[PDB]
A and B are shown apart, each in its own frame.
With several copies, the nearest count.
Chain A
Amino acid sequence: METHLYSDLAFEARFADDEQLPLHLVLDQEVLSNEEAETLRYVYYRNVDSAGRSTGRAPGGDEDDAPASDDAEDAVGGDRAFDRERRTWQRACFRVLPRPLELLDYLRQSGLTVTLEKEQRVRMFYAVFTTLGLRCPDNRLSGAQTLHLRLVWPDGSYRDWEFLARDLLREEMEANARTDEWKGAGVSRLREVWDVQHRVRLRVLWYVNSFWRSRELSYDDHEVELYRALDAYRARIAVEYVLIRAVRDEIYAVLRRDGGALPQRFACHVSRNMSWRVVWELCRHALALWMDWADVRSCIIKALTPRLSRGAAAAAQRARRQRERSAPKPQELLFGPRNEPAEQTWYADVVRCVRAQVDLGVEVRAARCPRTGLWIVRDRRGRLRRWLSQPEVCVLYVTPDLDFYWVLPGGFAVSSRVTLHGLAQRALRDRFQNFEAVLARGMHVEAGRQEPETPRVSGRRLPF
């Protein structure tokens, strides 16, 4: 109730510039857990048209083509495209009621007057209230328009739910003081709607006293527009998986390039009397099993995520500028100030062929050990994890850069790169660009300090 009415009047206020009509929503335990609902910081949502580009960027074309350029200094396009991607999303209103409830009961406890066609007893574990405004460009509206949701926790994580507007306005347009009249008129119907992937459903409300009911828009759903909107959604999903395709063809290229005699780049004791025909055969059987279990939550996606940040590109240029310099002169070392890569955070794909349980996202802190130390892979706690002793594993290592290691058991490795040049840029950002922190309640003003406890508007306590 608290955000629905306010954002309804706010979209009535801001309707002139961007014709956004409100969608009053509530979520449940199917969308997210209770712990995730207690600390949800803020919500982002994006209007993207049937052509599939955006509502923030330019109408015709963009400076977001020229697919990847495979660079380190710009490394996507620089931060201007990051500013663009920040300008795509909007920060909609947000309210959590973390307590079990019946929804129609709760609107009866408020001033809202409920009447549905038939009594649907809805009972969920908590409530979070959210309104979304989909932007009709003209007065008319396209059925193959699609939406995006982003749920942000203060750690920096995000979850993306995407769906078409066709299922949102399917039955509704076919049938079709201000705060006092809004309660008296109230709701007309309640409707649940799944996403495009059928992984989560969520309920929408429909008030009759909304200003949506008097705008008299027109609604059409042409099939060739639906045909291209899934094609634009095809490339949006495909940005994660054809990158995994780009890793696998790189392995088959360099192994044909080398000829099958691959070197060692990792510190392992070995044993000569142990057979190696058994080890080579378990390379092929397990390598396909990694492709069978590929996911967005993987090491190679986590390798890219610090690179698509705000201060990543200028710091990456600062890295090579510190390397590519002269040796310190004899006049420098006596009177210049003291001049500054000990260990790096690597991400790892651990596959195991004995039980077919593959671990995708693994933090690894690795460093050069002394006395011609090739590489040694420790945990966050110096555990020296020791999976690569066993015959049952194969492991893939990535760097914060695009350097890439496929390591056989016994620590024998294949050193290659990561090629993303086949991937375009605007789909590379919107899947996993590292978004910046925006200040809210309980946040320090200056950039980073000893942060206090979380807000945690929860149901275990009273609100106060």
Chain B
Amino acid sequence: SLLHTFWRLPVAVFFEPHEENVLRCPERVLRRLLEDAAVTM
């Protein structure tokens, strides 16, 4: 499940509209989406 990266160390960003950030959905929203995908069908 866990990815296999290339760099050993992660870095920081500056929140531009140019750098392609990853999603900000910490612990509650992803549980909300999995409950959503469970109850959609």
The answer to A–B direct touch (Cβ < 8 A) is yes
Q: Which secondary structure characterizes the binding site on chain A?
A: loop
Q: What's the nearest-Cβ distance from chain A to residue B2, in Å?
A: 6
Chain A CB within 10 A, most for which of B3, B25, B35: B25
Assembly CA distance A275 to B28 (angstroms): 12
Q: Which secondary structure characterizes the binding site on chain B?
A: loop
Assembly CA distance A376 to B19 (angstroms): 10
A438 CB-CB contact with B under 8 Å? no
Q: What's the nearest-Cβ distance from chain B to residue A239, in Å?
A: 21
Count: A-B pairs, CB below 8 Å: 136
Q: What's the nearest-Cβ distance from chain A to residue B5, in Å?
A: 7
Q: What's the nearest-Cβ distance from chain B to residue A267, in Å?
A: 4
B33 contacts A263, C-beta separation under 8 Å: no
A353 contacts B1, C-beta separation under 8 Å: no
Assembly CA distance A280 to B25 (angstroms): 9
A273 CB-CB contact with B under 8 Å? yes
B33 contacts A282, C-beta separation under 8 Å: yes
A294 CB-CB contact with B under 8 Å? no
- Contact segment of A34-42, A90-98, A384-392: A384-392
A384 contacts B18, C-beta separation under 8 Å: yes
A264 contacts B21, C-beta separation under 8 Å: yes
Assembly CA distance A272 to B22 (angstroms): 10
The interface residues of chain B lying within 8 Å CB-to-CB of A264 are 17-19, 21-23
A272 contacts B23, C-beta separation under 8 Å: no
Which residues of A come within 8 Å of B, CB atoms? 252, 255-256, 259-264, 266-278, 280-282, 284-285, 288, 353-354, 356, 372, 374, 376, 383-384, 386, 388-392, 408-412
The 10 A-B residue pairs with the shortest CB-CB distance, nearest first, are A260-B25, A280-B26, A269-B14, A267-B17, A260-B31, A285-B37, A391-B23, A263-B22, A276-B1, A271-B22
Q: List 12 A-B contacts (CB under 8 A).
A: A260-B24, A264-B17, A264-B23, A266-B17, A270-B14, A272-B5, A273-B13, A276-B2, A284-B33, A383-B17, A388-B20, A410-B22
